[PDB]
Amino acid sequence: DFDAIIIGAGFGGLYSLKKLRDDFNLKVRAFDRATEVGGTWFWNQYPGALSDSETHLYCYSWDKELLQEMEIKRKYISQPDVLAYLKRVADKHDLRKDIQFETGIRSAYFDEENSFWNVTTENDEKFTARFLITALGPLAAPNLPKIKGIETFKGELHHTSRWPKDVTFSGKRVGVIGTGSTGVQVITAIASQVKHLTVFQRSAQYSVPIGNVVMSETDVAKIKENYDQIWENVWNSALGYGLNESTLPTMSVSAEERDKIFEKAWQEGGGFRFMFETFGDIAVDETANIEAQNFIKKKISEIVKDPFVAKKLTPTDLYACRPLCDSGYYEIFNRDNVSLEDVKANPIVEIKEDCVVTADGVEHKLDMLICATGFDAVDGSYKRIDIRGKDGISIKDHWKDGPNSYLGMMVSNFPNMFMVFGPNGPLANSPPIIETQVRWIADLIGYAEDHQINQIEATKDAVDNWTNTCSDIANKTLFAKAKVYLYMGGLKEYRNQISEVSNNNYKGCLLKQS
Numbered sequence: 446d447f448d449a450i451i452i453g454a455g456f457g458g459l460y461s462l463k464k465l466r467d468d469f470n471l472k473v474r475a476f477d478r479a480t481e482v483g484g485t486w487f488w489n490q491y492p493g494a495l496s497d498s499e500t501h502l503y504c505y506s507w508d509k510e511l512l513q514e515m516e517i518k519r520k521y522i523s524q525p526d527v528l529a530y531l532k533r534v535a536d537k538h539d540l541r542k543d544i545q546f547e548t549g550i551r552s553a554y555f556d557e558e559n560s561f562w563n564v565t566t567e568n569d570e571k572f573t574a575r576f577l578i579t580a581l582g583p584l585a586a587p588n589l590p591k592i593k594g595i596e597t598f599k600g601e602l603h604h605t606s607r608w609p610k611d612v613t614f615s616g617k618r619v620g621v622i623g624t625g626s627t628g629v630q631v632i633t634a635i636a637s638q639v640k641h642l643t644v645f646q647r648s649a650q651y652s653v654p655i656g657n658v659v660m661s662e663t664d665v666a667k668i669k670e671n672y673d674q675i676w677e678n679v680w681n682s683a684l685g686y687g688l689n690e691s692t693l694p695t696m697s698v699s700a701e702e703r704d705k706i707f708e709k710a711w712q713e714g715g716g717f718r719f720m721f722e723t724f725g726d727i728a729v730d731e732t733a734n735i736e737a738q739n740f741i742k743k744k745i746s747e748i749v750k751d752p753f754v755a756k757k758l759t760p761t762d763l764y765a766c767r768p769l770c771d772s773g774y775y776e777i778f779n780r781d782n783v784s785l786e787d788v789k790a791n792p793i794v795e796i797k798e799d800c801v802v803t804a805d806g807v808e809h810k811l812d813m814l815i816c817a818t819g820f821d822a823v824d825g826s827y828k829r830i831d832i833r834g835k836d837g838i839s840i841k842d843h844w845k846d847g848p849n850s851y852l853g854m855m856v857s858n859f860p861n862m863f864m865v866f867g868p869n870g871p872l873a874n875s876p877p878i879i880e881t882q883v884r885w886i887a888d889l890i891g892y893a894e895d896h897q898i899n900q901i902e903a904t905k906d907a908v909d910n911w912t913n914t915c916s917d918i919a920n921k922t923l924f925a926k927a928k929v930y931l932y933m934g935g936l937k938e939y940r941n942q943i944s945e946v947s948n949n950n951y952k953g954c955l956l957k958q959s
């Protein structure tokens with residue numbers, strides 16, 4: 446018996462355990478397949494792994510002593526340093542004693558008679574808990590490219606999510622499939638280290654500089670002496686990235702001023718900065734969106750000197766979503782040892798024991814093939830668990846057509862289950878999202894113990910309500926006209942929404958007593 450069981454020991458799971466155990470005095474147990482805390486920051490160890498959020502905001506806000514103690518080494522934070530940070534959080538707050546590592550959860554069945562959850566590990570260990578906290582993260586199963594003969598490769602073959610230790614690059618011909626956020630980071634990091642690099646690009650994306658620089662002691666003092674206001678700005682923002690979120694229409698200024706504003710963001714760095722600190726309608730107005738695209742296209746044409754390589758790197762879609770961010774990606778393609786293959790025009794048709802074969806018949810001989818090919822959608826981590834709620838319906842069947850939920854934290858037909866960083870949540874910096882959701886869930890659980898209620902479930906109508914406001918907001922935005930579900934109202938408005946619920950006797954939830 447526990448009051449609550451937590452699945453996950455990343456950002457979301459660690460704060461779930463701290464809040465429920467230490468601030469609400471509940472008996473809690475957390476589970477993770479990993480051998481150590483960190484979640485994705487433990488698993489994902491590929492070359493160039495780096496946060497999109499600046500270091501001073503990609504962390505917890507609730508421990509004011511930790512904020513003053515925190516190492517702020519560079520403007521953005523690398524994977525080993527995030528892992529060290531989360532390890533420090535677990536050390537200080539004595540969290541590992543209530544985490545069972547090396548333990549996967551195979552099934553969670555709701556007991557409508559007892560109003561609690563039956564949780565079974567992959568090693569046939571069974572536990573009971575009133576509440577189930579799922580902190581599964583945004584990444585589901587790794588997506589490997591389905592290419593004929595991929596199993597015949599005799600060289601080194603790795604998905605970026607399973608990057609091994611001790612990988613050496615010198616003297617090797619290396620290929621990378623994928624030019625998303627992960628592919629851009631890997632390509633930029635290893636191009637100077639390999640004998641030759643082939644990039645297999647199916648769809649070119651826009652990328653802006655991240656501007657990762659060392660932080661002076663004065664830089665760090667400016668942050669730490671003003672940390673209270675910094676976090677106040679995060680909670681009062683849409684994105685939680687510390688940006689000066691613009692309301693200025695793109696076309697409302699001259700072409701000269703518009704170039705100056707984009708260049709200012711380009712120099713300071715950041716993908717969210719480029720869309721949302723420059724102007725306020727780049728994700729809404731088609732003409733504004735094209736203006737943002739053309740600036741980056743001009744940058745690509747200026748950086749990469751071979752015009753034909755520049756064209757291959759230039760995105761073709763009419764409208765643009767999130768720009769990537771990089772630490773020198775486009776410059777990579779000026780190198781003598783880098784080849785760019787347009788795999789939309791020249792698809793990969795086969796790979797053999799020593800090569801990747803394109804449709805033109807060319808054998809690209811490789812010692813190592815890196816698959817930066819992404820993951821399944823976020824609900825896949827839930828579908829991967831045998832979660833059964835009321836009447837025995839499984840989350841696999843309940844979400845056969847995609848995820849739907851109430852406020853991004855409760856699922857109809859699944860009582861006493863609360864998701865942290867689950868689907869249908871806000872589009873913002875994730876640590877502020879996770880802190881908001883954990884505090885909201887913990888307040889609801891505390892409200893449950895105070896009023897002797899032992900079953901909490903969101904109604905079907907509340908779920909469809911939440912789906913409606915998400916679809917309404919999303920359809921005002923170009924994110925539907927371009928390249929599984931998000932609330933796009935921002936962190937501030939998201940916090941207003943869930944506050945209205947908790948302030949009105951948890952409107953939309955069923956609360957059973959006993």
Ligand SMILES: Cc1cc2nc3c(=O)[nH]c(=O)nc-3n(C[C@H](O)[C@H](O)[C@H](O)COP(=O)(O)OP(=O)(O)OC[C@H]3O[C@@H](n4cnc5c(N)ncnc54)[C@H](O)[C@@H]3O)c2cc1C
Pocket residue numbers: 452453454455456457458476477478479483484485486489494495496497498499503548549550551580581582583584826830865866873874875876879
């Ligand atoms: C390089 C990189 C940079 C990023 N930068 C940003 C950024 O700037 N801003 C941002 O908002 N987001 C960013 N992200 C996204 C990132 O996933 C989140 O910021 C955050 O780490 C999510 O934490 P989490 O605890 O919610 O999930 P995770 O860290 O993914 O933790 C999930 C954990 O649950 C465990 N688990 C899952 N299923 C089971 C099961 N059945 N049994 C047992 N254990 C299970 C997993 O093993 C894992 O340890 C970045 C991601 C990467 C990889």
Ligand SMILES: NC(=O)C1=CN([C@@H]2O[C@H](COP(=O)(O)OP(=O)(O)OC[C@H]3O[C@@H](n4cnc5c(N)ncnc54)[C@H](OP(=O)(O)O)[C@@H]3O)[C@@H](O)[C@H]2O)C=CC1
Pocket residue numbers: 495496497498589590591622623624625626627628645646647648788817818819820
């Ligand atoms: N710094 C950060 O905050 C980071 C965040 N992330 C997040 O995690 C998620 C994953 O990012 P990423 O790991 O880049 O995965 P993505 O899905 O974002 O990028 C996948 C890449 O692989 C290519 N690809 C996929 N399947 C094939 C195939 N069969 N043949 C050829 N090419 C293929 C895609 O091309 P196409 O576009 O043509 O499908 C795309 O270029 C993203 O949502 C991102 O936001 C990840 C890393 C860093």
